[PDB]
Amino acid sequence: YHKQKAEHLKRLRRIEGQIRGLQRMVDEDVYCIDILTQVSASTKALQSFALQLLEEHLRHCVADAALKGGTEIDAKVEEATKAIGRLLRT
Template sequence: MSTPPTTTDAHDGADPCAGAHPPHAAHRDKDAHLKRLRRIEGQVRGIHRMVDEDVYCIDILTQVAAVTKALQAMSLNLTSEHLRHCVAEAAVEAEASGRTELIDEKVAEATAAIGRLLR
């Protein structure tokens, strides 16, 4: 069994976005993300119930579209958060250390994530 990642205190100077799996507690809007996910989860349960009850397919598709839009909105919010925090921090660190590859890595990471969202 693997050990869960530890959170990093924002004041200790460590980059909370470093590595392949940054501590997710670093999200500034964690509570809002969780609230949105609970709402989406409820919508998906509603779709499940609609299918189980043989609701008209167009009504189900309408709800699927709503869940899809909700997930897209959350993805956009997380992307914005990543750009504002992780990429910006990498730019500051790259400038201070002269290691321009730091910003290139974060931009490549963000670009790949956006590419996965657009598929």
């Protein structure tokens, strides 16, 4: 958990780096297509971060499944599926 946490924070540090980069590009009147390229890179990084958190969550649901009971499993999977739907709509 500690290793995964450190890795998540490092991914978000990178992303905030990208967003600071975007501000500097806008400030410096950088050609809009070059900015769009960096926007797409930042969105991709966020998506990759989201998938890593989802995978870790699903792994936990697997680890704990025998303790939870059918109702709680169904509710966790319904919730994850909804989060996946919201992710898909970006």
